[PDB]
Design a protein around this ligand. Structure first.
Ligand code: CLR
Ligand code: CAU
Ligand code: 1WV
Ligand code: NA
Length: 455
């Protein structure tokens, strides 16, 4: 029938906003429920609920149904909302003035708040019936509704404002696009870094002292691909933190830990190659294989101290409205910090290692020119291995310097960094966990090592 597609459209709107379940389940109050919030019965008996389902559906479902049958239930719930809207003196005149798309927005609010809940938006309702859409969208956003479910509320409010479905089309392709891209990013990180660890760990040719440090660097990248990036992607895709306040702080701590360990490992590398080329005899006299393992544990030990300790102590916390409402919402895991912590933490964990790692390695890179004023083909074999260390140090500074310059600009004046931009700089740094294994293939020894392990 020519009216069928409007029922499918509003069904898909709420499918995105409330979700869909095709098997009977208990709602938070414990009543048997299926579909998009269709409450089957308040009776405790499960068979009474399947009985009510089989009546509405016209077959013996055994408590399982198809998408199309879930839409059949939902059309009945939509009729009940319309009846309630039509009997509410504040909502009926607005509903009568709206087209199908804006009626779907209003019906969607009714599913979330109820008629009385929507009826309390007395000024926004006046602006809708007055077709002052942009002003209705502003007043609607000034609400606890908007603050508690901003993703759904932005979509509904955009729908009242434009009169289109574009916010729901934009969402559904965002979940598919970014859901896929994030999946590939987690695999490219876990794949490239798991290979680098096993290659150095079981290739005798690769068991270089510098490769002992690179295994620390790849070990940081692998925790990123296992315990950090996968969970930060759910925020980028789902629009909220699903794992509670406790795992929010732990995730944040491991995230700060791995980044702090990486720049410190790059700094220890630059200090290793500087001692190696300025004082070779002290290098042989000082660095045993076991002491090199001690530097790694000391780096992670300093990193966990400078990462876990401030975070578990809540030294980072701020008093702003943005900060307190996130701290009191488990669904929010934004890392809102006080201006003091934003500086001291990023300086101790990053700028200081970045300057030493950048200052020392340049004096390393110039002394090699000071000792090789010649043309040579075998020199290319050693300029290449030195260049690889300067690429990894460079790609790290590129992937993460913007995130930390914005972090200090954000501290003095939040005006300048959009949250959209700051999140993008943070994912430029997450991408570094992918690049390193690719850069490790620049050297011939890793190259034949990767090629043998894959067959
Ligand atoms: C995700 C968090 C909570 C766990 C942290 C993992 C810790 C234990 C990791 C980080 C880097 C790892 C070190 C890096 C590589 C080496 C060199 C290897 O030849 C011996 C072990 C040693 C020294 C690792 C010990 C374990 C280690 C310190
Ligand atoms: C989603 C958020 C939690 N991700 C954090 C960054 O990946 C890494 O952030 C840091 C690493 C090391 C030191 C740091 N000091 C900071 C101050 C503010 C924000 C991040 C950091 C930070
Ligand atoms: C590597 C490229 C990844 C880009 C990811 C962009 C994240 C998106 O902008 O999120 C906006 C934030 O406001 C969500 O909270
Ligand atoms: Na929170």
């Amino acid at each position: 029938d020519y009216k069928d597609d409007d029922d499918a459209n509003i069904f898909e709107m709420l499918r995105i906003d409330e979700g869909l379940r095709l098997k009977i389940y208990k709602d938070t109050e414990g009543y048997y429920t299926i579909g998009i919030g269709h409450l089957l019965t308040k009776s405790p008996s499960l068979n009474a609920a399947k009985s009510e389902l089989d009546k509405a559906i016209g077959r013996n479902t055994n408590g399982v149904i198809t998408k199309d049958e879930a839409e059949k239930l939902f059309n009945q719930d939509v009729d009940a909302a319309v009846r309630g809207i039509l009997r509410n003196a504040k909502l009926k005149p607005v509903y009568d003035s709206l087209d199908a798309v804006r009626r779907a927005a209003l019906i969607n609010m009714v599913f979330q708040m109820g008629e009385t809940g929507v009826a309390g938006f007395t000024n926004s309702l006046r602006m809708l019936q007055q077709k002052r859409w942009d002003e209705a969208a502003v007043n609607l956003a000034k609400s606890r509704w908007y603050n508690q479910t901003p993703n759904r509320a932005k979509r509904v409010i955009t729908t009242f404002r434009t009169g289109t479905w574009d916010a729901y089309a934009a969402s559904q392709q965002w979940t598919a696009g970014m859901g896929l891209l994030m999946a590939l990013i987690v695999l490219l990180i876990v794949a490239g870094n798991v290979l680098v660890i096993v290659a150095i760990a079981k290739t005798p040719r690769l068991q270089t002292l510098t490769n002992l440090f690179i295994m620390s660097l790849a070990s940081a990248d692998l925790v990123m691909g296992l315990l950090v990036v996968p969970f930060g992607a759910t925020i980028v895709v789902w629009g909220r933190w699903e794992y509670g306040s406790f795992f929010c702080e732990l995730w944040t701590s491991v995230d700060v830990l791995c980044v702090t360990a990486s720049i410190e490992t790059l700094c220890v590398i630059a200090l290793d190659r500087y001692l190696a080329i300025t004082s070779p005899f002290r290098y042989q006299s000082l660095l045993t294989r076991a002491r090199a393992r001690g530097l790694v544990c000391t780096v992670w030990a300093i990193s966990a101290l400078v990462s876990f300790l401030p975070i578990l102590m809540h030294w980072w916390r701020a008093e702003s409205d943005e900060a307190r409402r996130c701290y009191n919402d488990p669904k929010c895991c934004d890392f809102v910090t006080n201006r003091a912590y934003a500086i001291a933490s990023s300086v101790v964990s990053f700028y200081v290692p970045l300057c030493i790692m950048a200052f020392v390695y340049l004096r390393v890179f110039r002394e090699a020119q000071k000792q090789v004023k010649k043309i040579d083909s075998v020199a290319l074999r050693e300029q290449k291995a030195l260049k690889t260390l300067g690429i990894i140090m460079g790609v790290f500074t590129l992937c993460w310097l913007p995130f930390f310059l914005a972090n200090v600009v954000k501290a003095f004046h939040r005006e300048l960094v959009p949250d959209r931009l700051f999140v993008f700089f943070n994912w430029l740094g997450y991408a570094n966990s992918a690049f390193n294994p690719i850069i490790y293939c620049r050297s011939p020894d890793f190259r034949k090592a990767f090629q043998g392990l894959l067959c």
